[PDB]
Amino acid sequence: PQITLWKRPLVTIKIGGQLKEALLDTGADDTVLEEMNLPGRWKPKMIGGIGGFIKVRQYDQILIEICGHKAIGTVLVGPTPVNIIGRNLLTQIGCTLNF
Amino acid sequence: PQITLWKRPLVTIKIGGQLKEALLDTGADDTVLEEMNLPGRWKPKMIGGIGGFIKVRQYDQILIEICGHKAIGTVLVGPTPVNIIGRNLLTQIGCTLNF
């Protein structure tokens, strides 16, 4: 689809039999959710934002569908105020910015 | 232009007569730039991100050119580690997400 930006670009994402929603975030290197269904052992990771640096839980090779486009990659769990789909998964679904 | 997402979508901007580069951030409601002087008066605002809140100075009705497309709107200025063009100006240049 073609998504205008007059509001936040929240999309249906599915993970672990749960439909959640998350923001298609071209400013995020990573995909970051606040919490994810019981998906295994995680590894420590540090990431940053404009307010400073936070500790997150890294889960690799996660199966996710974004608008029913299938993708696969690292999903971090961390204190993000909105769930965000970062470029790591945006490139897999063929998403570009256009103007 | 079409911009793929295999690296951060950094583009050239012109603001306050200075060329800079900045990050096309669909996960940013507002535009936040590194400390610079801009014309007019400012008012204090708080902006949320990863890592917490930051205090910014809000200038309204600022002209900025992003890859040759002029836009007028609110620019926040403060201690961001990266210049960020948020949806409030990405809509003004007709920037959309495509997949």
Binding site: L23, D25, T26, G27, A28, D29, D30, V32, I47, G48, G49, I50, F53, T80, P81, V82, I84, G86 | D25, T26, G27, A28, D29, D30, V32, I47, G48, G49, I50, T80, P81, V82, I84, G86
Partner: peptide
């Protein structure tokens, strides 16, 4: 607001 991830 929010600005989003390095």
């Amino acid at each position: 607001x929010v600005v989003x991830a390095x």
